[PDB]
Structure formats: C-alpha cells, structure tokens
Design a protein around this ligand. Structure first.
Ligand code: DAU
Ligand code: DAU
Length: 288
C-alpha cells in the first residue's frame, strides 16, 4: 500500500505562527508536527509515501525528511497550488498511486494509543473498500461525523453537520482501495468550496463499502488546529515521554523496530546526533 500525508493548508487559525512556517512544521513538544502522521503510516507498514504541501512549504518538508533512505523508506513530494480540499490528495497523487491501494493521513492529526500498530496493519492489509476511524468527541459539529448501527454498520456520514447525528468524529486517517482516485475526480466542491474527503467516504457508503473502526475512549486523538489545542497536544506528549523511557513518533526508532533499517544503520544515524538527547536516545536503542 502507498500512503499520502496532506501537509499543506493555510493554518489561518494559528496566525502569526503560520506566516512563515507551515502548521505541520510547528513543534508538538519535541518534534515537528509532521513526524506524528508520518509515524502512523510507517507503523501501518507503508514504505512508499507522498507528502503534499503548499508551493512554499513543500521544499521545507523535503529539507526536513529527505527522500526516506535514512528511514529505509521512500518519500516523495508534490505541490498543492491551492488548499482546495482533502480529496485533492488523490488527484495530485494520481501518478504516484498508480493501480495501488492508498492510505491518507492528515498532517495536523495526532493519534496515540495502545493496540494502534496492530489496528493500522490490519486496515492496511484490507484489500477492498474504505476504512475510517471514529472517535467520540465533545463538539462533533467541528468534524466529519459518522452515524452507525448496533452492529457497527455505517448509516450516514456528514461534514461538520449543524445537527450532528452522533457524537463520533471521523478522524484524519483513511485507508482506500484504488477506486478512490476516480471517486476523487468525480466529486464537486461543497458549500465550503472544498473537495471533501467526506464526499469520498459517501461514495463508498453508497456502495456499502465504508467500514468504521471505533478508536475507543482509551485512545488519544488530538489535533493541533488552535493555539490552545496545539499546546495541549504538546503537554500530552511530554507527559507520556517523561514517565516512560520511550519517545512517541521517533521516526528512526520506528524504522529500526519495523525492520526497515538495521542496528548498524541506526548507529550511523545516531552518531551525528550524539550532541543532543535525541541522538543519545537512538544510540541507547541501537545498543540494546
Ligand atoms: C483543505 C486542505 C487541508 N490541508 C491539510 C491541513 C491539515 O493538516 C489537514 C486537515 O485540514 P483542515 O482544514 O484542518 O480540516 P478540518 O476542516 O479540520 O476537517 C478535516 O479533518 C477532520 C479531522 O481532523 C475531519 O473530521 C473532517 O472530516 C475533515 O474534513 O489537511 C491541505 O493540506 N490541503 C487542503 O486542501
Ligand atoms: C512501537 C512504537 C509505537 N509507537 C506508538 C504507536 C501507538 O500509538 C503506541 C502503542 O503502540 P503499539 O506498538 O501498539 O504498543 P502498545 O500498543 O502500547 O503495546 C503492545 O500492543 C500489543 C499488546 O500488548 C503487543 O502485541 C505489541 O507488541 C505492543 O506494542 O505507540 C510509537 O510512536 N513508536 C514506536 O516505536
């Protein structure tokens, strides 16, 4: 499976933070925001990944992450000339996707919880249909909202409904089979002027092929869309990492743990970083 990170947009709410930095280049505690959705695609077993951003920001992501060889993966880049909708990812990424299935993750989403790696690899290995991930939230009108059965069967899906049909947000992580490219070409802009991922999911729902996994109250799903929520997410990660010997979304660690790179290769990455705690972390891991 291939994966795309949609890592553009204006980040208007975070102004002036986003006047000269992409929202997805801002810190979440100790690492750039984009590390977090990238880690999710890596843990799903996805090694061929396209990162989409604005004309100004795309080369900044490429500066940060490179072509992926350090992580035993392939990273490519594409520009989105205007933030015209999530569904544009599959239009921009058409040549990249080819005939393959593809996962999409939103650049400003932070997922964390027990059992997630297993859940990801399951979804990544499903060959047909769309898999979306629901989460019970306080203000469901702020999100795509999914309404489902006692058996977990989807009934409806709506983008930012004024009257939400349930409390379950549709989070920014989606797994699709190859139909999604032609689906995305056939949707049209909503009232917000955007080619909506919710309309991609509606197409699968019409076919009876939209499948929801509920993440559960024990899972953390945050986004960094406001100054307050960005700061809370940073605090959340700090609290986790302080207690444990372990980092969240440490890309080099994940590359090693997923078998994408060797112990020796991890040492080589750790060497030029031994001057900081991050390199020290990687080196301790290599020597375990
Ligand atoms: C519209 C647009 C967005 N983006 C990036 C910026 C963010 O990292 C990410 C999500 O865009 P936002 O405009 O923040 O999305 P938002 O309105 O919060 O809602 C989206 O994300 C929510 C989950 O975070 C879902 O519940 C909604 O269904 C989904 O439409 O995509 C792009 O890179 N290109 C775009 O065209
Ligand atoms: C391995 C690894 C995980 N993660 C994140 C992904 C998840 O949000 C969170 C938990 O990841 P998991 O790999 O599912 O670990 P967790 O679910 O707490 O614990 C276990 O889940 C299963 C049941 O105990 C075990 O079979 C797994 O070996 C073990 O991982 O940590 C990272 O950010 N970095 C990592 O290197």
């Amino acid at each position: 499976m291939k994966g795309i990170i949609l890592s553009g947009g204006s980040g208007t709410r975070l102004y002036p933070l986003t006047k000269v930095v992409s929202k997805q280049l801002l810190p979440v505690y100790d690492k750039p925001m984009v590390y977090y959705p990238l880690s999710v695609l890596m843990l799903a077993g996805i090694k061929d990944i396209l990162i989409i951003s604005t004309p100004e920001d795309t080369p900044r992501f490429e500066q940060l992450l490179g072509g992926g060889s350090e992580l035993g993966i392939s990273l490519s880049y594409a520009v989105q000339s205007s933030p015209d909708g999530l569904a544009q990812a599959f239009i921009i990424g058409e040549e990249f996707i080819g005939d393959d299935n593809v996962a999409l993750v939103l650049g400003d989403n932070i997922f964390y919880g027990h059992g997630f790696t297993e859940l990801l690899q399951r979804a990544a290995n499903r060959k047909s249909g769309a898999t979306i991930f629901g989460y019970n939230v306080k203000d469901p009108q702020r999100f795509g909202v999914v309404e489902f059965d006692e058996k977990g069967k989807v009934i409806s899906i709506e983008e930012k409904p004024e009257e939400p049909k349930s409390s379950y947000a549709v989070t920014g992580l989606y797994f699709y089979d190859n139909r999604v490219v032609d689906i995305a070409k056939n949707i049209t802009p909503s009232a917000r002027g955007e080619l909506e991922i919710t309309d991609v999911n509606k197409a699968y729902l019409e076919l009876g092929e939209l499948h929801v996994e509920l993440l559960g109250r024990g899972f953390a799903w945050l986004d960094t869309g406001t100054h307050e929520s960005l700061l809370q997410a940073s605090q959340f990660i700090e609290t986790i990492e302080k207690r444990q010997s372990l980092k969240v979304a440490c890309l080099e660690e994940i590359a090693y743990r997923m078998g994408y790179i060797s112990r020796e290769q991890l040492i080589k990455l750790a060497e030029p970083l031994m001057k900081n705690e991050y390199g020290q972390y990687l080196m301790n891991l290599a020597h375990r």
